[PDB]
Design a protein around this ligand. Structure first.
Ligand SMILES: C=C(Oc1cccc(C(=O)O)c1)C(=O)O
Ligand SMILES: C=C(Oc1cccc(C(=O)O)c1)C(=O)O
Lengths: 283, 285
């Protein structure tokens, strides 16, 4: 029997928002200490929760629903302080005309869709007829007045499709900041509690390697954008602005925002309004 | 509609034999120009042949069966000149006692299993009772006199299991070298012909990036083995010896060996004995 140690199974969001991080993991050689899995954020969260991954990114809403079973990594997250550029509401009408209107929710999202619902109800006062469908701006606009998108599809709606076809594109990060003055966190990195307790060292080394890879990705954002632009409708400048508008910090200001968002949606999203976020303790 | 250009879909053998190359692809940043797929060599060959990949490693036997539809990359392959360490025959008896005996063939292999059959029949003169099964030395040894293994399972049989349980482990690379004096090639890198013709630049850049990643992996072999040893029953010295015993060249001497092997097995393995190997041509300037 081969009872040797086994690499941690690590999820990774396939979208552009984590492409610089993937660059960092590869350039540092960290990838060879992972058994990596790429998917969309809702799938990666499902996989970590059910045990098909040991460590990975978790969309915030799904993390809070499973907070007792997850240990969040400090000082890294997928967030924003103001605009996030790639979490948006695309609408053919002003937001105050969406009461009773058909609003499409991209299936790949769990946190942005909930944040959009929070804003429309509690900030703008509209009660739309929501439905979930795969992300597709062309099809969504034919069946609904507005659509909530994340990832590359939202970046394309914001940078390309919206301007071309004269559609309003609302940045969810900006709408949240206007309403609360706070930054926002869409996803955290977490280890399964059972894995963190079985392998405290590997979990710590994975966390430290993510920080080192994130730090390197910030320093070489220009190189990453140049290479990534060759395979996208986006150009180098647009990607570089997107990569640098994204906020990957996860300290006290970011937890402050998580706390307040959890309070406003918790009782209606399946976790206590005062849900406890357990963070990986340093040595 | 997003009509932008799309990354080539590139296969990669998950075994240790291509772990240094994976290190190279990551350190150079090449991975961010690929849409990578990791699997075992027989699966990757099926995927490239059926069109689920654009470029990838192809076990030689499967490449030769589809040679008209594949374009091989020059100057990189998975081969050996003498021992390969991770393509073996594990046997409880001397090889000359395997006539009519049960011999198990690891499912993940296509070329080593054929080479083992060629050697046992044409060099040693035994006609065993072959059967194919998933790679598992413990299960294979209770049901058969000998077993053919590749990859990490063969490296484990050669370095650990064999010595512990007193089993003979024959290196297929060495047996071929003894018989012919030639090196051997187990897998090549190839692009689908339709993809190579639709995207000559991307194919060329992928080829050049593989060479650059391979070269870097050779220079940093010690680092790769140190890191990889932490997740293996093998130690740093064993991995470094394995990485440096592997021969990743694919030039005239290696093509010579491919030609002769194809000649000896072709008519009984589903391709002409004189099958034509088309190589990716470099650009004129
Ligand atoms: C921040 C972005 O989008 C995301 C990322 C992760 C999770 C979610 C979600 O809504 O669950 C959204 C981006 O693409 O920049
Ligand atoms: C060379 C090794 O094994 C291989 C690699 C690729 C294909 C095959 C095959 O037999 O089809 C075997 C090694 O593991 O070092």
């Amino acid at each position: 029997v081969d009872n040797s140690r086994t690499r941690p199974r690590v999820g990774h969001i396939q979208f552009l928002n984590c492409l610089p991080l993937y660059w960092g993991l590869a350039r540092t050689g960290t990838l060879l200490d992972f058994e990596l899995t790429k998917d969309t954020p809702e799938k990666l969260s499902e996989q970590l929760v059910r045990g098909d991954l040991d460590i990975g990114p978790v969309t915030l809403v799904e993390f809070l629903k499973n907070a007792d079973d997850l240990v969040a990594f400090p000082d890294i997250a997928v967030g924003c302080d103001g605009p996030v550029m790639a979490c948006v509401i695309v609408s053919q009408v002003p937001l105050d005309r969406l009461d009773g209107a058909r609003v499409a929710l991209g299936s790949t999202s769990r946190t942005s869709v909930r944040l959009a619902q929070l804003l429309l109800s509690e900030r703008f006062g509209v009660q739309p007829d929501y439905y979930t469908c795969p992300p597709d701006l062309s099809l969504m606009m034919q069946e609904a007045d507005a659509a909530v998108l994340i990832g590359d599809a939202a970046l394309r709606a914001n940078m390309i499709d919206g301007p071309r076809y004269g559609l309003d594109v609302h940045d969810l990060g900006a709408l949240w900041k206007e309403w609360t003055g706070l930054p926002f966190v869409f996803a955290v990195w977490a280890a399964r509690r059972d894995y963190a307790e079985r392998e405290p060292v590997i979990t710590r080394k994975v966390h430290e390697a993510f920080l080192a890879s994130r730090n390197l990705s910030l320093e070489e954002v220009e190189k990453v954008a140049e290479q990534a632009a060759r395979w996208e409708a986006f150009d180098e400048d647009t990607l570089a602005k997107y990569f640098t508008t994204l906020d990957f910090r996860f300290g006290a200001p970011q937890l402050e925002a998580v706390t307040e968002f959890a309070r406003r949606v918790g009782p209606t999203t399946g976790f206590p309004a005062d849900v406890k976020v357990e963070l990986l303790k340093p040595l």
